[PDB]
Symmetry: C4
Subunit: 91 residues, 4 copies
RNA sequence: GAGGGAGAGGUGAAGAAUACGACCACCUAGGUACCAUUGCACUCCGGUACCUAAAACAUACCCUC
RNA sequence: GAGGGAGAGGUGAAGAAUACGACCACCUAGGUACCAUUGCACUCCGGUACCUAAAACAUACCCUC
RNA sequence: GAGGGAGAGGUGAAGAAUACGACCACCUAGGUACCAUUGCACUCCGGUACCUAAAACAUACCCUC
RNA sequence: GAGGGAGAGGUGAAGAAUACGACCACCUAGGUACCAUUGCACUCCGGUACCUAAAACAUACCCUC
């Protein structure tokens, strides 16, 4: 994919409760720049995944490159740019 | 919060015994500067949490920024400045 | 061993499914340069092990040195140069 | 303690078999310099502990400082200088 | 008589031909399994169930003669 | 007659008033729990036990009338 | 009469000498164990089993007198 | 007679018409589950329970004829 304000994370530990996952993702990622939102759902299709929306695409890029494969509750994070803009970025 | 000599850590693994937790927190954090004390309680309200008191606010700041989200017994540490001075700092 | 386009990893967590292992190994290693392939088998003789084939021996060398002992699904990765060229490198 | 060619590690995961522990400790530590030996015993008194003997005290010092608190099979390593020279260093 | 065995987390009560372990009452520290808890403190203190807390001798107690 | 229900991992055999799922035989991929394995490859392939592999109709099969 | 005890996730129905908890019907949030899921979203929503959702009084209900 | 089957961690004892596996005694390495242990070493060595330690033939042993 191509750089995007939003990174898509998967291979996340699915036992982690939604709000803990968000707070923890925030703690991994805030070092890279300002975060607008972190979206998590534990539904069947969306579990093990998160979207982290940065204010700036440069934050997204550094995040993705630095945290690629990083240990997070016992599994390595796999990180991609989101395939499309998040609503709050497009709008 | 605002910088403080003391950092507040949570999202800690609650199976870890108090003295092990302290010794381990000391090993994460001593690289950042001198530590006056580490307070841990496994009570219901205080489990999963620690206070690490640095001699210098600059140590606290580097600690917090470097170790934010860091893997510690299988969970990411979440770090904040303490909301108030610890007794040994105020007094 | 002597430098090789291919690194041999072992001490891998054997519960991890083959395609997850590959995707995760790719996420640990792609930072070091271009990867031609990652070979994994869960057979008795080959479980807990992977071969990661880099385009360039310099990528292999940096990978091996940086990721040596690195946490990966709860175990430290142990990394060596492959003892021989992978087919796609020799051919 | 005072710098020593040998570092003493504890808080090690005690489920890990002796030879795996050695190979893994070797993989954490060889980046710091040449290692003469790694001693591990799983006896009651000596389990959860290792001695890593470096050729040079400077290797020991960098190791200790860099790897202090580092994640190793799910627990943070706690590192000290050995209190005395190992036999192979004294002799 | 012999010879073996087992009992002390702490305080008490009982008993005292007994410094001494069971029974009974009360109180503590530490842990384990499960459940609940994401929580900002600077005497301690969630729940349910289980476990552990130096030890020889002697009395009493158990086995063999 | 009505009305309900359940059966297809793949190939075969049986049966065919039947494209069609059970029984029987054979073969595959993927997984789970436990045990074993630290192992250098570039067709696949450790063990023990369990599970899963699109699905409507029709025949046959099960229930009510 | 006395004295004890237990019941409210939410809506309803029943009942109302009763604001009030069981039974019955319906609906929600959160979790746990196991199984399945590697998945690109920007109302929610996999399965199987289990659990939890402030609480005093009163009626009714249970025990002792 | 035929044909099938199963037994060797190591040392010993028994037995020897037998190099040879069961029974019995003793000793080792490695592991697993649970419990305990945070511990500074440079012969080994916590507990409780379970498991594993190359293997063909022959004797003996088990099944069919
Ligand atoms: C109170 N009396 C009946 C007993 C008694 O008189 C004794 C005696 N020596 O005569 C006791 O020692 C006893 O009072 C006494 O203290 C006993 C005692 O200490 C004890 C302990 O500690 C552990 C196990 C046991 Cl079986 C006993 C036990 C049963 O011996 C009791 C016994 C009584
Ligand atoms: C061989 N014969 C006794 C049966 C038969 O003649 C049939 C028939 N239609 O007459 C079949 O279909 C059958 O040959 C036939 O194929 C059967 C069949 O397919 C089936 C399946 O697939 C699943 C469940 C069931 Cl209970 C059956 C079952 C029992 O109907 C069998 C029946 C036989
Ligand atoms: C409908 N009738 C038989 C009962 C009745 O007439 C009552 C009464 N006060 O007379 C009720 O309160 C009742 O209608 C009524 O509502 C009952 C009730 O609320 C209740 C609750 O909440 C919890 C436990 C229990 Cl045991 C009861 C229970 C049994 O008392 C019922 C009783 C009935
Ligand atoms: C001592 N005597 C009764 C037996 C004997 O005389 C033998 C014989 N060949 O006559 C043995 O081989 C025996 O002494 C002997 O050594 C036996 C033996 O080795 C053995 C093993 O290794 C495994 C399984 C089994 Cl069932 C046996 C077993 C039962 O055959 C014994 C048998 C005895
Ligand atoms: Mg790291
Ligand atoms: Mg006792
Ligand atoms: Mg004792
Ligand atoms: Mg006592
Ligand atoms: Mg005393
Ligand atoms: Mg007294
Ligand atoms: Mg007594
Ligand atoms: Mg008295
Ligand atoms: Mg306690
Ligand atoms: Mg929990
Ligand atoms: Mg408790
Ligand atoms: Mg005694
Ligand atoms: Mg089926
Ligand atoms: Mg199907
Ligand atoms: Mg079939
Ligand atoms: Mg077909
Ligand atoms: Mg056919
Ligand atoms: Mg048929
Ligand atoms: Mg036919
Ligand atoms: Mg398969
Ligand atoms: Mg294993
Ligand atoms: Mg298998
Ligand atoms: Mg159907
Ligand atoms: Mg209730
Ligand atoms: Mg309630
Ligand atoms: Mg209700
Ligand atoms: Mg209301
Ligand atoms: Mg109503
Ligand atoms: Mg009522
Ligand atoms: Mg009415
Ligand atoms: Mg819910
Ligand atoms: Mg899974
Ligand atoms: Mg569910
Ligand atoms: Mg009440
Ligand atoms: Mg055997
Ligand atoms: Mg054998
Ligand atoms: Mg033997
Ligand atoms: Mg021999
Ligand atoms: Mg002999
Ligand atoms: Mg014999
Ligand atoms: Mg003889
Ligand atoms: Mg052993
Ligand atoms: Mg433990
Ligand atoms: Mg043992
Ligand atoms: Mg044989």
């Amino acid at each position: 994919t191509r750089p995007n304000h939003t990174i898509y994370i998967n291979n996340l530990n699915e036992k982690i409760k939604k709000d803990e996952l968000k707070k923890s993702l925030h703690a991994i990622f805030s070092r890279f720049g300002q975060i607008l939102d972190i979206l998590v759902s534990r539904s069947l299709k969306m579990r093990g995944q998160a979207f982290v929306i940065f204010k700036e695409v440069s934050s997204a890029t550094n995040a993705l490159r630095s945290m690629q494969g990083f240990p997070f509750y016992d599994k390595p994070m796999r990180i991609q740019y989101a395939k499309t803009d998040s609503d709050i970025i497009a709008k």
